[PDB]
């Protein structure tokens, strides 16, 4: 499959050790700004779509509105305390709901909050 000019469009990766240093420095640079906070926001536990991966389970994008209200976290506060929020996702079953309001309840137990001023 070398019918076209593959010479002009070949990309090597000698920056693979150098990009890893930059990526680890970006995580250190981010943690200097958000010094007591974790680097990454909290994400929900969701089930993979297809029949091939139904039995597996991964992290989603953000918590549903019903999950936040059941846990006791107000919607407009959640992005400001490290909880990602997805308005598109729906619950559609009690098993998806109960797994995530356990996760948010477990987040609140391990969370320490500091007053505003």
């Amino acid at each position: 499959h070398f019918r076209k000019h593959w010479q002009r469009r070949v990309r090597c990766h000698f920056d693979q050790p150098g990009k890893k240093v930059t990526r680890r420095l970006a995580r250190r640079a981010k943690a200097a700004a958000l010094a007591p906070r974790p680097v990454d926001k909290l994400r929900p536990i969701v089930r993979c779509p297809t029949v091939k991966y139904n039995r597996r389970t991964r992290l989603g994008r953000g918590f549903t509105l019903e999950e936040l209200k059941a846990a006791g976290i107000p919607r407009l506060l959640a992005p400001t305390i490290g909880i990602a929020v997805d308005h598109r996702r729906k619950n559609l079953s009690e098993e998806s709901l109960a797994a995530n309001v356990q996760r948010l309840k477990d987040y609140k137990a391990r969370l320490i909050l500091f007053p505003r001023k």
């Binding site: 729906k90 619950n91 559609l92 079953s93 009690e94 098993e95």
Partner: protein, 88 residues
Amino acid sequence: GHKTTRRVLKERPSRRKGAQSKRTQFVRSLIREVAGLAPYERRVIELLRNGKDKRARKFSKKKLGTFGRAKRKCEELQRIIAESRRAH
């Protein structure tokens, strides 16, 4: 496949994202009377008043391009004939 306890969802506010309000239907009925009719709609109205409903459905189909749009246009123009006759 797997059995789960399905929940009942809150009504999505994007249901029927077009028009079902009484205000928009008032505006459309007002604008249609103040603007008049298209040239092809005058042809269909003449045929519908003369009973040539068979020709009118065909003529709206060539102009619009789809049988479903031809039914709706002939339905809308038939209502105009009905409410113009009552006012007369």
